[PDB]
Ligand binder design. Structure first.
Ligand SMILES: *[C@@H]1O[C@H](CO)[C@@H](O[C@@H]2O[C@H](CO)[C@@H](O[C@@H]3O[C@H](CO)[C@@H](O)[C@H](O)[C@@H]3O)[C@H](O)[C@H]2NC(C)=O)[C@H](O[C@@H]2O[C@@H](C)[C@@H](O)[C@@H](O)[C@@H]2O)[C@H]1NC(C)=O
Ligand SMILES: *[C@@H]1O[C@H](CO)[C@@H](O[C@@H]2O[C@H](CO)[C@@H](O[C@@H]3O[C@H](CO)[C@@H](O)[C@H](O)[C@@H]3O)[C@H](O)[C@H]2NC(C)=O)[C@H](O)[C@H]1NC(C)=O
Ligand SMILES: *[C@@H]1O[C@H](CO)[C@@H](O[C@@H]2O[C@H](CO)[C@@H](O)[C@H](O)[C@H]2NC(C)=O)[C@H](O[C@@H]2O[C@@H](C)[C@@H](O)[C@@H](O)[C@@H]2O)[C@H]1NC(C)=O
Ligand SMILES: *[C@@H]1O[C@H](CO)[C@@H](O)[C@H](O[C@@H]2O[C@@H](C)[C@@H](O)[C@@H](O)[C@@H]2O)[C@H]1NC(C)=O
Length: 524
């Protein structure tokens, strides 16, 4: 174990990502927009920076960036939720009501669905929450374990007052999504037809089903269906602690979701993010007509270090979700536009040359709170995970940026493109030399990314102390990770352009913004 100093640990706290004042935070819960405020709830341990004693924290903002702490929303305080309050989804009804479904756990570890709602709908801040006196409302059916019956989705409307929700589970090694019908969100009936199932995935947690447009650049309200509408089906794959999605079609008549590509079905195809990114939940934003995705990123250091610093885990910056209309076969994820309100000043680097085996310093001053947009051109089998990262030199890769780096590269975090031979483009993030400390993650993360005719290779990086978020080709591929440098901290952190290819030189242009604090604080 590394002997972390107070100064090394203090630096790890983020400037502009959501995290509570102290302690453990994890899964997103019941995100909504209501009466001028974006609302976010989250799993929270009041006692220690480890998983447990599960309650719901609550925060609000005008803009998805400038968060304000509110009082705890739900506590573990009844027999049916004494071992924790978990994974909630809100359904907002036409009459103005907000119905919050959650999973409560008993002393025996038995999981059951329960209902909560606001004490006062006239309160824009929704400070106080009440539990339905008829709780608990739903226990596991005969085919599903009562200790693994969790995570109701946001509802979608059918007809004649009937709504549907999804609950993920498994049968043996096959992941499944069950559907229940309700008219009041107090009593539920299980449908005979599953929404969908995929063999050899294991348990599906946190199932999400939502419409996306094939024509516009707006998100769609959750109950929208029709001819120019496709549906994303998403599941958190428990055995992998990773989130997978697929694009398909949902039929209200049959209650079946069918994949456009069975080879890329839920759990065996595309991910929202190829890094550390879990329990994602979307909601519809009526203010700017967007669909927004929340997800948490666990610490990648030791539990010993977490207990010493007194906190664990952060949320990514929320992202929009749209269908990629250029390909038709993936989604695009991109940080919400309000993140740009943090941009202080910019510096531009135009047509910088990097020959084979070169490293080029980029003088930006402090390099710990940044938004970076870069484009690369090559002047006139492989797998990120099993590769040697930036050290594995090929004819047409690797090339990209070094973030969280020292002057002499004693520590560095490469984010790069690698073109392999029909050519494939890989986009990867290399943790192998991110820190001199031995008890942190040292993996290479990534995947292929589609690069279309005439397109430059493009990446955007958000750098914020111990979290880095990366985006290729406008969000066709994303990679999120955590870094814990021992030396590349405060003024000692630097930024570089690099090209470790053997048979290509590159030309790059960059624009880099220093980023302000989000000033996350208590509501007054
Ligand atoms: C690129 O290389 C990586 C590393 O080898 C591949 O990921 C690995 O895939 C294995 C399956 O081929 C996984 O094995 C499983 O291990 C767990 C226990 O850890 C078992 O419970 C389970 O039954 C499997 O045996 C392995 O976990 C996984 N390693 C990592 C670090 O993720 C990768 O394969 C691709 O990703 C994985 C996650 C699966 O989705 C595969 O279907 C998929 O091919 C390689 N990529 C490619 C394109 O081949
Ligand atoms: C560009 O590619 C070269 C060639 O692979 C990289 O240099 C190589 O860097 C690796 C990793 O630092 C060296 O491997 C060794 O790893 C062990 C740990 O297992 C360590 O104890 C050694 O001290 C050493 O670091 C390797 O020797 C070195 N190879 C050569 C020929 O110099 C280079 O780092 C890459 N550039 C960038 C910016 O990443
Ligand atoms: C999960 O795996 C179990 C073990 O293979 C399945 O039970 C087996 O089902 C066979 C018929 O498909 C039957 O010959 C075996 O005797 C039986 N084995 C045991 C130990 O029960 C199970 O299949 C479900 O449960 C059985 C009893 C039948 O009702 C099937 O129709 C069910 O599918 C597997 N579960 C699923 C959902 O596939
Ligand atoms: C949840 O709260 C309870 C009661 O307040 C605490 O006892 C738990 O603390 C942990 O468990 C006890 C028995 C002891 O081992 C202590 O060292 C632990 O911190 C607390 N649990 C968690 C996971 O924070």
């Amino acid at each position: 174990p590394y002997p972390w100093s107070n100064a090394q640990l203090s630096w790890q706290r983020t400037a502009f990502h959501f995290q509570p004042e102290r302690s453990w935070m994890s899964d997103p819960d019941g995100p909504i927009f209501y009466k001028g405020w974006y609302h976010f709830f989250y799993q929270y341990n009041p006692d220690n920076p480890v998983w447990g004693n599960n309650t719901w924290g609550h925060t609000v903002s005008r803009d998805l960036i400038h968060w304000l702490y509110l009082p705890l929303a739900l506590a573990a305080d009844q027999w049916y939720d004494m071992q924790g309050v978990f994974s909630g989804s809100a359904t907002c009804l036409p009459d103005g009501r907000i119905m919050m479904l959650y999973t409560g756990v008993t002393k025996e570890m038995v999981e059951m669905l329960s209902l909560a709602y606001p004490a006062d709908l006239s309160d824009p801040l929704l400070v106080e929450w009440v539990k339905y006196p008829g709780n608990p409302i739903l226990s596991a059916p005969p085919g599903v374990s009562p200790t693994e019956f969790r995570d109701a989705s946001t509802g979608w409307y059918v007809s004649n007052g009937t709504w549907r929700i999804a609950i993920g589970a498994k049968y043996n090694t096959t992941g499944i999504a069950m559907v229940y019908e309700t008219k009041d969100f107090k009593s539920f009936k299980l449908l005979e037809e599953l929404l969908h199932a995929v063999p050899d995935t294991g348990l599906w947690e946190c199932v999400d089903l939502y419409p996306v447009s094939t024509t516009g650049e707006k998100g769609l309200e959750t109950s929208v269906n029709g001819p120019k509408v496709k549906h994303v089906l998403k599941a958190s794959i428990d055995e992998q602690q990773r989130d997978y999605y697929a694009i398909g079609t949902y039929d209200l008549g049959t209650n079946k979701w069918t994949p456009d590509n069975p080879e890329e079905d839920v759990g065996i195809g595309l991910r929202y993010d190829w890094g550390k990114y879990y329990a994602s939940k979307t909601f519809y934003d009526p203010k700017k007509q967007r669909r927004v995705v929340w997800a948490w990123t666990k610490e990648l250091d030791s539990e010993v270090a977490d207990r010493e610093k007194g906190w664990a885990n952060v949320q990514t910056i929320p992202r929009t979700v749209l269908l990629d209309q250029k390909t038709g076969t993936n989604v695009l994820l991109w940080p919400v536009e309000e993140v740009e309100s943090l941009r202080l000043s910019s510096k531009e680097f135009s047509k910088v040359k990097a020959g084979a085996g070169s490293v080029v310093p980029l003088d930006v001053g402090t390099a710990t709170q940044l938004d970076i947009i870069a484009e690369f051109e090559i002047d006139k089998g492989y797998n990120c995970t099993t590769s040697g990262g930036a050290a594995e030199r090929g004819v047409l890769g690797p090339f990209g940026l070094l973030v969280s780096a020292t002057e002499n590269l004693s520590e560095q975090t490469p984010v790069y493109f690698y073109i392999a031979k029909n050519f494939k483009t890989f986009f990867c993030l290399d943790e192998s030399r991110s820190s001199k400390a031995s008890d942190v993650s040292k993996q290479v993360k990534g995947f292929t990314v589609p690069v279309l005719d005439g397109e430059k290779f493009t990446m955007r990086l958000l750098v914020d102390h111990s979290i880095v978020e990366s985006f290729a080709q406008g969000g066709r591929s994303c990679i999120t990770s955590r870094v814990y440098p021992t030396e590349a901290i405060y003024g000692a952190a630097k930024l570089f352009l690099f090209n470790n290819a053997t048979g290509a030189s590159i030309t790059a242009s960059l624009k880099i913004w220093e980023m302000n604090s989000a000033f996350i604080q208590p509501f007054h």
